[PDB]
Write a protein that binds this ligand. Structure first.
Ligand SMILES: [Zn+2]
Ligand SMILES: [Zn+2]
Ligand SMILES: [Zn+2]
Lengths: 48, 49, 102, 214, 48, 511, 64
DNA sequence: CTCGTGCCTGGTGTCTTGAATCC
RNA sequence: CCCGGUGUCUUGGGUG
DNA sequence: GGATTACACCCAAGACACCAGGCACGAG
């Protein structure tokens, strides 16, 4: 249970849009802004 | 200066103008690279040279 | 809640004052003590809560050496040790104290 | 000898069960109530014991002979995850579930509470009952400067200066020992009792600043 | 009003894909029309 | 009174003494809005002061609670929080006063109210458009699907108008593809679709000849019978009630090992409750659900036989507007359960001490007060931790740029379909909008055609009890559902009251 | 064609979970439960609509 | 003088179940 | 005695 | 299962709950 949780945090640190499992959440309830989400979409590093 | 603006300057062929807009007139930055490994891993003290 | 430092049982502290330690009231006499005595033989600090339902046939109970005691809540680890004067008095009674603090 | 009490194949099985974090003690309690309430009836709860280890968050262990008894123990318990997640423990892993587990005088600990939280202190004395102790620590004082404290609005650490206290705001007790605002300072250090449960004794890392001082 | 408001985004997407498909295509000094890989798209621009 | 009592229980052995702890919620009382200073002093709050000090214009709500203590060897009014008051309503301190005093309270007589004040900011609730409950709608399905026609209905009770469940009946088989063209249904909390005949049997009417007598009321037409042919044969081997109910209980696949002795009794709840709960939920009334089920299948086949068009989703008679009343009740319902659970979790610790609780201490008014304030201030319709999977924009800051804009803003309606998907239906001005929503007033841009505005003479139904209507229908000659046979009644008219096939009359013209 | 499916059901005898395999032969309307552990076998009739939960239900009633 | 009881603050923290069509 | 800067994430309505 | 719904500008309104510990106040 411990080792899988380290795998989990390292995964959602890089990509928090993994299909088929719940997203990592901030205390505020909104999803964590992972590095992958920083680069994609209209406002990310590349298009924005 | 959005994506569609960028395309218009290409069509005009004004390559020099487009470079300046996106660098000198904005967020131009100087970095050091290693000629061997190509990474930005250089530690540069400019007063000690 | 406090844990007896002789048998490991977990009870509300006032119980130790009202009725003594069910398992070791006889030698410990907490029923007829003052609060200073109760607090020297029972601890507010303990860890590992154990429901023992069947003391005589539980392996868990045998390991914790509570297999001869009454069904109840017990603690795996009880912090503190019995005062040397009480240990000496228990030994006068043929009782051997094996500390439960680890 | 403890070695004669090791478990065997004749002993009941132990299952682990996942429960809501922080509700492990409650589940152990609830299991005991159910066991005692059903003793001697036609439908006894056929578990022997149940327990929860602090080191093992969100997991209760239950001793029985049949898996069905585990389901019976947990039925209706609002603190237990409904998924059929009950896992078997090996006999060779039983003892490692019930393992129970310094602060010598002249050694260093870190304080865990109050204006001295995080500060390094020497463990000068230990209370007889064993409940507390006495620690030697570098004071954080103002000499009553703005009187008519918290850890976020405390003062910088510095040795007690009795002549500063004399000048600005004090009871001599002994050689180098003063009581100032009802605390004791000996040769510049505060001597104050803390609960043992309020001091860290393990894995303490001295800081740069502490290496410079001590 | 609905049509103008809806179909403006339809054609806006069309223009974006067209530009990215064609942006690197340049006339070179030998008259050929080539992309950034030097692939020949037309041997002579506009055939004239 | 939706969940009127809390109940505990505890068998004690040490002389078994069952001690049920019970708490009953009674009458509600309301007080006028009151400002309580940090001092402790109180006074009546009027609107302008709330606007100037960023306060919330709200009324304290008190609830009677009653304790009782069953014991078997075998009082003061409590405050639940504050509810924001709509200005100029009956519970606002401005409703009285009259013309002479209004000017002294700095209130303008042209201000017609209809909005709330939350932290000094004026918030108006936007009417939310939804589909009607308790109506059957038939739609056609796209080509790459084995289904060609679907009947759908969303369950909802009358008491409080809150959603319950949703149910579908799908007709499989494409044009000359799908072989056996049978019909299966979808039930709440069951995995994969179950054939229609099986659920008919599972309700107590196994006789095939009786089954077809409940659906088709025209034995003469072969077509309304050839399409039901494969449904009989694919559910032939299930020949009695018990094995029918069992199969449904296995479909759910919840708690593997339910068994027949009980897996039937779990499925009987999924049939009695949840499945069509708007008809009835008391026992021994399964005749109404069986008759209704036959009606659905009949409607499904009429569309598949091209004898009736598929329903028009935009027909305004199939639509409802949720205004301030219904919207608050749904939110208040969610929050009152949250308060309930916190009372229940608090009793299990405070009774292990065996100490008489003070009652008020076990009611934290922050649950309702912060809940209503947060949702009205942000528009996020749900619990704060679940900003996701909820609806946004229900509350908006009242536009005060000009007087005309205030009138329009208080009469706005919203369809919550979404910007994504242009579509060629919703945004469009449907014929049935005539006289009910404005044909001209609609925003430019992404909301165009989805946000609408009520015509000048429109009104919204407040709601009325259906019970007096039933009494009027039976007094005039309506005949019960147990007396009805398609051979005898081959021509009478069916009668629906809020989507329920109650009684059928033989002479509708006089009625 | 036969269907060989693994399930997450507990064997009623050996109590090993996730070790019951279901073989459904629809051509002859014969379903077969197998353990992978103690390997106890149980046969029951199946229709065309049945699934591993249908014969595992029949196995619970065949014991009691 | 000493014990019972309410308020402020910091470390910690998760779950009763409840929009459509191109490749 | 030069130099001297302050916000991030969402929601609702507009403009073209 | 995923992939997407043209580009640019402005306005206003909201941001973390629960339990253990100490400290201060009141009563005997
Ligand atoms: Zn390098
Ligand atoms: Zn004891
Ligand atoms: Zn087996």
């Amino acid at each position: 249970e411990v080792e899988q949780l380290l795998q989990f945090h390292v995964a959602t640190y890089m990509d928090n849009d993994i299909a088929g499992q719940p997203q990592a959440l901030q205390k505020s309830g909104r999803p964590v802004k992972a590095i992958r989400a920083r680069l994609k979409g209209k406002e990310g590093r590349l298009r924005g | 200066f959005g994506e569609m603006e960028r395309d218009c300057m290409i069509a005009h062929g004004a390559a020099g103008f487009l470079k300046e807009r996106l660098m000198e007139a904005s967020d131009a930055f100087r970095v050091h690279v290693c000629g061997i490994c190509g990474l930005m891993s250089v530690i540069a003290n400019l007063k000690k040279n | 809640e406090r844990a007896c430092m002789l048998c490991g049982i977990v009870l509300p502290g006032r119980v130790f004052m009202q009725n003594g330690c069910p398992n070791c009231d006889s030698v410990l006499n907490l029923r007829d003590s003052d609060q200073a005595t109760v607090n020297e033989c029972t601890s507010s600090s303990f860890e590992g809560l154990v429901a023992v339902g069947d003391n005589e046939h539980s392996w868990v109970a045998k390991w914790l050496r509570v297999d001869r005691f009454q069904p109840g809540l017990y603690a795996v680890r009880v912090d503190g040790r019995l005062p040397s004067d009480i240990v000496a008095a228990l030994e006068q009674y043929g009782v051997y104290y094996r500390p439960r603090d680890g | 000898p403890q070695r004669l009490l090791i478990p065997t194949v004749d002993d009941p099985g132990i299952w682990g069960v996942k429960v809501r974090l922080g509700k492990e003690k409650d589940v152990v309690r609830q299991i005991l109530k159910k066991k005692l309430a059903r003793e001697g009836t036609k439908n006894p709860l056929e578990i022997y014991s149940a327990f929860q280890r602090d080191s093992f968050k969100g997991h209760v262990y239950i001793e029985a002979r049949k898996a069905e008894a585990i389901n019976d123990a947990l039925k209706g318990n609002v603190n237990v995850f409904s998924n059929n997640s009950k896992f078997l423990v090996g006999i060779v892993e039983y003892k490692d579930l019930l393992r129970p587990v310094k602060l010598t005088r002249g050694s260093y600990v870190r304080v865990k509470n109050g204006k001295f939280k995080g500060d390094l202190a020497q463990v000068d004395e230990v209370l007889e009952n064993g409940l507390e102790a006495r620690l030697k620590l570098v004071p954080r004082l103002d000499y009553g400067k703005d009187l008519s404290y918290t850890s976020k609005f405390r003062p910088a650490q510095r040795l007690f200066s009795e002549a500063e206290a004399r000048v600005h705001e004090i009871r001599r007790d002994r050689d180098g020992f003063v009581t100032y605002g009802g605390e004791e300072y000996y040769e510049g250090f505060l001597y104050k009792t803390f609960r043992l449960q309020n001091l860290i004794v393990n894995s303490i890392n001295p800081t740069l600043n502490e290496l410079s001082l001590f | 009003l609905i049509d103008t408001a809806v179909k403006t985004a339809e054609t806006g997407y069309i223009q974006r894909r067209l530009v990215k498909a064609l942006e690197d295509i340049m006339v070179h000094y030998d008259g050929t029309t080539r992309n950034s890989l030097g692939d020949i798209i037309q041997f002579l621009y506009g055939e004239d | 009174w939706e969940e009127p009592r809390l109940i505990l229980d505890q068998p004690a052995q040490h002389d078994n003494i069952n001690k049920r702890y019970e708490i009953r919620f009674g009458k509600i009382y309301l007080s006028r809005p009151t400002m309580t200073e940090a001092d402790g002093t109180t006074h009546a709050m009027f609107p302008q002061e709330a606007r100037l000090r960023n306060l919330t214009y709200s009324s304290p709500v008190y609830l009677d609670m009653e304790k009782s203590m069953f014991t078997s060897i075998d009082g003061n009014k409590v405050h639940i929080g504050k509810v924001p008051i709509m200005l100029r309503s009956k519970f606002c301190s401005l409703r009285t006063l009259d013309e002479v005093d209004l000017y002294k309270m700095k209130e303008c007589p042209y201000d017609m109210g209809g909005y709330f004040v939350i932290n000094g900011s004026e918030k108006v609730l936007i009417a939310q458009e939804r589909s009607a409950a308790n109506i059957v709608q038939v739609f056609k399905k796209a080509a790459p699907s084995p289904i060609s026609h679907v009947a759908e209905i969303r369950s909802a009770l009358e008491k409080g108008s809150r959603l319950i469940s949703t149910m579908q009946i799908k007709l499989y088989g494409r044009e000359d593809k799908g072989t056996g063209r049978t019909i299966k249904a979808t039930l709440p909390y069951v995995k994969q679709d179950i054939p229609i005949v099986i659920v008919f049997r599972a309700l107590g009417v196994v006789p095939d000849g009786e089954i077809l007598q409940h659906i088709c009321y025209d034995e003469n037409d072969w077509q309304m019978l050839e399409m039901l042919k494969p449904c009989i044969e694919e559910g032939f081997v299930i020949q009695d009630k018990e094995v029918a109910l069992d199969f449904i209980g296995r479909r759910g696949s919840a708690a593997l090992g339910i068994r027949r002795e009980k897996r039937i009794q779990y499925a009987k709840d999924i049939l009695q409750k949840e499945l069509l709960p708007h008809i009835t939920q008391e026992e021994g009334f399964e005749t109404r659900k069986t008759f209704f089920l036959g009606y659905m299948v009949n409607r499904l086949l009429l569309c598949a036989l091209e004898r009736k068009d598929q329903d028009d989703r935009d027909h305004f008679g199939k639509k409802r507007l949720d205004l301030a009343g219904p919207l608050l009740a749904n939110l208040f319902r969610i929050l009152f359960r949250k308060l309930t659970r916190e009372i229940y979790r608090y009793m299990q610790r405070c009774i292990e001490t065996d100490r008489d609780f003070n009652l008020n201490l076990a009611v934290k008014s922050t649950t309702i007060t912060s809940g209503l304030k947060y949702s009205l201030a942000t528009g996020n319709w749900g619990e704060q931790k679940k900003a996701m999977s909820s609806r946004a924009g229900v509350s908006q800051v009242l536009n005060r740029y000009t007087y005309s804009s205030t009138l329009s803003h208080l009469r706005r309606t919203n369809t919550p379909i979404g910007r994504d998907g242009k579509l060629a239906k919703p945004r469009q001005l449907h014929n049935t909008h005539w006289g009910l929503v404005c044909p001209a007033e609609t925003p430019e841009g992404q909301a165009c055609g989805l946000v609408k505005n009520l015509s000048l003479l429109s009104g919204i139904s407040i709601g009325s009890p259906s019970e007096p209507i039933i009494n009027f229908l039976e007094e005039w000659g309506m005949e019960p559902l147990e007396d009805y046979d398609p051979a005898q009644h081959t021509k009478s008219t069916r009668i629906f009251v809020n989507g329920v096939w109650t009684g059928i009359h033989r002479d509708p013209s006089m009625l | 064609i036969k269907q060989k499916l693994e399930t997450q059901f507990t064997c009623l005898f050996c109590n090993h979970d996730n070790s019951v395999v279901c073989t459904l032969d629809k051509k002859n309307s014969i379903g077969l439960l197998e353990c992978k552990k103690c390997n106890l076998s149980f046969q029951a009739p199946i229709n065309s609509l049945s699934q591993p939960i249908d014969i595992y239900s029949d196995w619970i009633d065949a014991c009691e």
